[PDB]
Design a protein around this motif. Structure first.
Motif, PDB file in Angstrom:
ATOM      1  N   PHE A   8       0.906  -0.945   0.022  1.00  0.00           N
ATOM      2  CA  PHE A   8      -0.282  -0.269  -0.389  1.00  0.00           C
ATOM      3  C   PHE A   8       0.999   1.700  -0.225  1.00  0.00           C
ATOM      4  N   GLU A   9       0.524   2.703  -0.403  1.00  0.00           N
ATOM      5  CA  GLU A   9       1.179   3.581  -0.408  1.00  0.00           C
ATOM      6  C   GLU A   9      -0.335   4.392  -0.004  1.00  0.00           C
ATOM      7  N   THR A  10       0.101   5.343   1.395  1.00  0.00           N
ATOM      8  CA  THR A  10      -0.846   5.940   2.079  1.00  0.00           C
ATOM      9  C   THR A  10      -0.813   7.325   2.647  1.00  0.00           C
ATOM     10  N   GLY A 139      15.759   5.836  -5.283  1.00  0.00           N
ATOM     11  CA  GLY A 139      14.548   7.267  -4.916  1.00  0.00           C
ATOM     12  C   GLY A 139      13.539   6.954  -4.978  1.00  0.00           C
ATOM     13  N   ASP A 140      13.037   7.718  -4.902  1.00  0.00           N
ATOM     14  CA  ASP A 140      11.524   7.411  -3.424  1.00  0.00           C
ATOM     15  C   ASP A 140      10.329   7.974  -4.326  1.00  0.00           C
ATOM     16  N   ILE A 141       9.467   7.689  -3.615  1.00  0.00           N
ATOM     17  CA  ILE A 141       7.673   8.468  -4.049  1.00  0.00           C
ATOM     18  C   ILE A 141       8.002   9.428  -3.311  1.00  0.00           C
ATOM     19  N   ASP A 142       7.366  10.622  -3.853  1.00  0.00           N
ATOM     20  CA  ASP A 142       7.815  11.910  -2.898  1.00  0.00           C
ATOM     21  C   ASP A 142       6.177  12.516  -2.043  1.00  0.00           C
ATOM     22  N   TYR A 143       6.445  12.015  -0.358  1.00  0.00           N
ATOM     23  CA  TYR A 143       5.423  11.800   0.296  1.00  0.00           C
ATOM     24  C   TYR A 143       4.688  13.325   0.827  1.00  0.00           C
ATOM     25  N   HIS A 144       5.818  14.201   0.544  1.00  0.00           N
ATOM     26  CA  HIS A 144       5.430  15.221   0.757  1.00  0.00           C
ATOM     27  C   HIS A 144       4.740  16.768   0.183  1.00  0.00           C
ATOM     28  N   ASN A 163       8.017  -1.825  -8.709  1.00  0.00           N
ATOM     29  CA  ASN A 163       9.006  -2.643  -8.140  1.00  0.00           C
ATOM     30  C   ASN A 163       9.754  -3.528  -5.976  1.00  0.00           C
ATOM     31  N   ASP A 164       8.390  -2.143  -5.316  1.00  0.00           N
ATOM     32  CA  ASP A 164       8.388  -2.896  -3.916  1.00  0.00           C
ATOM     33  C   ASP A 164       7.470  -4.244  -4.210  1.00  0.00           C
ATOM     34  N   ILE A 165       6.750  -4.302  -4.837  1.00  0.00           N
ATOM     35  CA  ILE A 165       5.780  -5.804  -4.796  1.00  0.00           C
ATOM     36  C   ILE A 165       6.833  -6.653  -5.247  1.00  0.00           C
TER      37      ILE A 165
HETATM   38 PB   LIG Z   1       7.664   2.956  -2.158  1.00  0.00          PB
END
Ligand SMILES: [Pb+2]
Ligand SMILES: [Pb+2]
Ligand SMILES: [Pb+2]
Length: 570
Positions: A8-10, A139-144, A163-165
């Motif tokens: 998930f991404e929350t 890198g990573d998803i921008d959480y801000h 990629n994560d899964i």
């Molecule tokens: Pb991620």
């Protein structure tokens, strides 16, 4: 039964906490996968697949699912009734399994079960990718970033989720293909051992003892030797070095004399029986630590003593302890004993062969191999011991939907699981203790600190008295681990070090006082996050050091959010 890797991404707001993206990928076929932006869409799939699903760190993701289930006509039940769900959530709040029950066709249960892949593979996703040699995006998803309901996932975010899964899909598949299919790493480890020994023989060498015996055997359990020399307490000290035992526990399991079979109960003091050479003695007495010797005895549940400190003296009251013969021999050497009363005890048949085949098999694979397979070999060797050293309490937490829409947890029924064979737990650790204490004692004039399998010493030269047992790789030997310019120890498990570093091809490794280019600052302190450690220096590292940057989990309507909390060194 299909298997899926999930994520998930929350959102991070207390008031607005929800899933904005999901992904699932077939573990056995990575071309079958889906990424969406709706939890409802995902949960509808959850109910249809009748599959086993895995999330990496269920504790977090699971809170979002339960929140959905309770809002969509599901209730918690242990019985596996239609339209209910079951859980395994430990006293420690570790999540193991959500079992969502829909109903029954014939006698065949129609259900989807969710597991925590973090119990199979106890590492962060990036750490896994790196070690298993799997493709990992930088890198990573921008959480801000603000994402309203219905927000469309960008192609880069889509890539990251996939990629994560996939990293987890790739690692789990490699594991299942070795035939390692149990819920936890330790279970896989136990299963592999059992396969080699044979169920028939296993049952004979490790019988299930009565709850009563088991209770007394565990009185002799002690753990790991963790001790700081008072001489060095809260003082900035100069140069020193650190030694580490190569696989301390597998090392004991491989060569030490260990117990097996049914114990024989005796009254009074043990007399040497070569058929039953190992024993546990319930003793009662007073003692004084000998001069120049390291403290050994710790008294766990008593009116008088402090459970955490190794005792210099019995303090004028009488000590009542249950000791393995390994511990007892060690005590007799380090202490003057007085008024020794021998109450009773248990004796055991003993051998040294029990673990050789299992360790050899996986030690082979380890050196023979590289990457993922190497990592799995390490897990097999390092996960087995834990299974012999666990208490029988399997009491769980029962979730409920709180008055205000968040999640609450109440303790469930008291419940007991049969132990594998506790005497094995007792002796593996006692031998471990012996290994460490023995070495530390031989270096009494330089010993700073001990922690289970490591020794910290004054100076930079290897002491003559242990040169013969120091090796970089040999099993059960001491490896010269690192060397520090200066250090400061506040107490057991609370200290900082300046480690000498040397560059060897871009990367940085441990160097000597002559051969070095850098100083690596290292912090060890219970409960302190990696982020907070970076704030610690030599000047500030004191009782009372405080930072408000420890994430705490907060149950809110919809799921869990992380919030900043004050952490302080007590
Ligand atoms: Pb991620
Ligand atoms: Pb990632
Ligand atoms: Pb008894």
């Amino acid at each position: 039964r299909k298997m899926y890797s999930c994520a998930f991404e929350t959102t991070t707001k207390v008031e607005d906490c929800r899933v904005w993206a999901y992904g699932y990928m077939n573990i056995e076929d990575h071309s079958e996968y889906k990424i969406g932006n709706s939890l409802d869409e995902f949960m509808a799939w959850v109910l249809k697949v009748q599959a086993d699903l895995y999330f990496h760190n269920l504790k977090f993701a699971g809170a979002f699912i339960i929140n959905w289930l309770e809002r969509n006509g599901f209730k918690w039940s242990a019985d596996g009734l239609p339209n209910t769900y079951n859980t395994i959530i430990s006293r420690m709040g570790q999540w193991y399994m959500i079992d969502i029950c829909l109903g029954y066709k014939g006698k065949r249960k129609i259900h989807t079960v969710i597991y925590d892949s973090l119990k199979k593979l106890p590492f962060p996703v990036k750490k896994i990718a790196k070690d298993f040699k799997l493709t990992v995006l930088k890198g990573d998803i921008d959480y801000h970033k603000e994402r309203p309901v219905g927000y469309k996932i960008t192609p880069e975010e889509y890539a990251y989720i996939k990629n994560d899964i996939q990293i987890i899909a790739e690692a789990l598949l490699i594991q299942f293909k070795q035939g390692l299919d149990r819920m936890t790493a330790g279970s896989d480890s136990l299963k592999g051992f059992k396969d080699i020994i044979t169920t028939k023989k296993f049952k004979k060498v490790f019988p299930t003892l009565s709850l009563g015996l088991d209770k007394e055997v565990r009185y002799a359990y002690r753990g790991g030797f963790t001790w700081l020399n008072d001489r060095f307490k809260e003082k900035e000290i100069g140069e020193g070095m650190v030694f580490d035992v190569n696989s301390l526990y597998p090392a004991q399991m491989y060569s030490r004399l260990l117990p097996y079979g049914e114990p024989i109960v005796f009254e009074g003091k043990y007399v040497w029986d070569e058929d039953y050479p190992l024993h546990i003695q319930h003793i009662r007495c007073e003692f004084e630590l000998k001069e120049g010797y390291i403290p050994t005895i710790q008294i766990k549940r008593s009116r008088f003593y402090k459970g955490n400190e190794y005792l210099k003296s019995s303090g004028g009251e009488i000590a009542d302890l249950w000791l393995s013969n390994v511990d007892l021999e060690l005590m007799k050497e380090h202490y003057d004993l007085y008024n020794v009363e021998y109450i009773s005890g248990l004796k055991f048949k003993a051998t040294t062969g029990l673990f050789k085949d299992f360790i050899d098999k996986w030690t082979y694979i380890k050196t023979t191999s590289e990457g993922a397979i190497k990592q799995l070999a390490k897990l097999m060797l390092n996960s087995l011991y834990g299974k012999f050293a666990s208490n029988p309490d399997v009491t769980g937490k029962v979730p409920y939907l709180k008055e205000n829409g968040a999640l609450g947890f109440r303790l469930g029924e008291e419940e007991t699981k049969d132990p594998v064979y506790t005497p094995m737990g007792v002796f593996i650790t006692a031998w471990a203790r012996y290994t460490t204490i023995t070495a530390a004692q031989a270096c009494y004039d330089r010993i700073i600190y001990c922690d289970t399998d490591s020794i910290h010493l004054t100076g930079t030269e290897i002491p003559d008295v242990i040169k013969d047992i120091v090796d970089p790789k040999k099993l059960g030997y001491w490896a010269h681990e690192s060397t520090f310019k200066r250090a400061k120890y506040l107490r057991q498990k609370t200290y900082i070090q300046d480690i000498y570093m040397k560059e060897v091809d871009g990367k940085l490794v441990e160097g000597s006082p002559d051969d070095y280019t850098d100083i690596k600052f290292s912090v060890k302190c219970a409960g302190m996050t990696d982020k907070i450690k970076k704030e610690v220096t030599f000047e500030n590292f004191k009782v009372g050091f405080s930072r408000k940057m420890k994430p705490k989990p907060v149950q809110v309507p919809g799921g869990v959010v992380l919030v900043d909390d004050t952490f302080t060194i007590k």
